[PDB]
Amino acid sequence: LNNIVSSLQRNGIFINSLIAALTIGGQQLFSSSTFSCPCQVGKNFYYGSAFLVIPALILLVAGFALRSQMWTITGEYCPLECKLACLRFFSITGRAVIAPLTWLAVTLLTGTYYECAASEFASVDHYPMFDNVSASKREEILAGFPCCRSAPSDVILVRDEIALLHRYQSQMLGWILITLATIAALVSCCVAKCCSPLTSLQHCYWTSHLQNERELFEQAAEQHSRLLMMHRIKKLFGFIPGSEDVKHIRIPSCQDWKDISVP
Template sequence: MDAFQTVVKFLISQKTTIGYSAMALLTVGGERLFSIVAFKCPCSSQNLTYGLVFLSAPALVLLILGFFLSSRTWKLFTGCCLSPRKLCLRGHSLQCIVVLGQIIAGALVAPVMWICVALLNGTFYECALSGWENDSFRSYLCQNKSPSCKASVYRVPCGKTKMNASDNEDVLLVLRAQSQVIGWSLIASTAIALLLVSCYSACRSQVSYLQEMFWRKYIEKERQHFEQFSDDYATKLADRNLKSFFENTKPDPLPLPSNNAWEEISALYSFNRAHQYYSTLHRYVEGGKRESNEDIQPAFGFVDGGQII
């Protein structure tokens, strides 16, 4: 039993890593499914459009889903049409740009995974680039090939060219190699960018590493208990109202947070050097108010749901 609890605790502590791993596996599986079941290169003048649509359209859908599933998106934009100052506080334009950048970066994880996996597989790229009607590019592909190569490059993915099988395979290998080189280059550049951003964020952090570990644990516990309290109080309110309705009696008083309280705890987190508030909820119950010297810190994006829900 102790061993089982240890395993459960480990999985819970590593749930972000597990989540991204699951996302990667789903991306790989989705790309393979698209390649085998849905994708059929037309081997015509429509190759370029068809290939690019399969390469980019799923990535766009994943990007939109990333925005939808990010709690930080809704914290930032909910109510901003009625109160534009909620979107960006006066004098905090740079911090607003940082927050938007964090939201975009989080939403880009799944699309970048899709594009990388698709490029490494090469199927979509082969179809798209075989239909690119660029004379220089086709001349490059058809070096030392038969004269009919340039005119029938768009048929290469289907293997229906007038070239011999060896030449057809050579052109296909060149396209696949280009696709994989671009894919690995994108993976490497993304990894380097993430490393640099993480190092810069840690370098600019105004709290120690151990305090940030404690902070993350607190935020996780607060979220868990918030969901439990929300469920409990929603149940109590529903029971009270239904009992009052069916028994035709006056409802018992049930204290609930005010609209202003909900607004306060729904705001994006901002760091104040003078106080140790670990969340907007913590700040509210301590009676603290947002001050003009507060800064939105990139290192503390985890506080208000920087990750996907």
């Protein structure tokens, strides 16, 4: 069963599904805990805009920076080589961006961020009751009603309508984004199937070679380091580490301790 789990982990689909589920759970928890939807007459679009965009950027940067392949590509950058580097960087791009896109889609489907962000940009020319010739009380009431100011004074029905409109609009935006995202993915794959010098068989072989070579290199490096130090300690204390030392003991002097202090 553990081997089956590891095989599923090898496949990316389960990993992206788990990442999306974690992002959904985090969005629901954050919305339940700390939204509070303030009415700040002056600065309220910025609150929702930050809560919508910034978490997406943190997810993007965390996803891209956490992969050492992007570091290796940047180090190589800092022909065939350019194409393989571009393909290698693009390979993990989908897993990098799957989290912020899920975040954005869930937030737009919920619509509360869009409601507390785009309320001050609502239209009042259609409503004669929202004339407010003073040109001042209109914006304060516009910013203050969506938050907690019910004020059942023959206004709530009107405000209810606007909320619905935004909600409807919110949904559309989310839907549109998803569609575009999908299209982008397809065209990206098209590039991966048009600009790739590798044939239908060379890509998987190359990726397996890179992964296998990194794994065997790290294991061999660890083994060689351990072996070099068994020899260093054998010279040092007169006996091999991990062996029986009933034969000889060095009994080192004080000056010897500084010798192994070079590294």
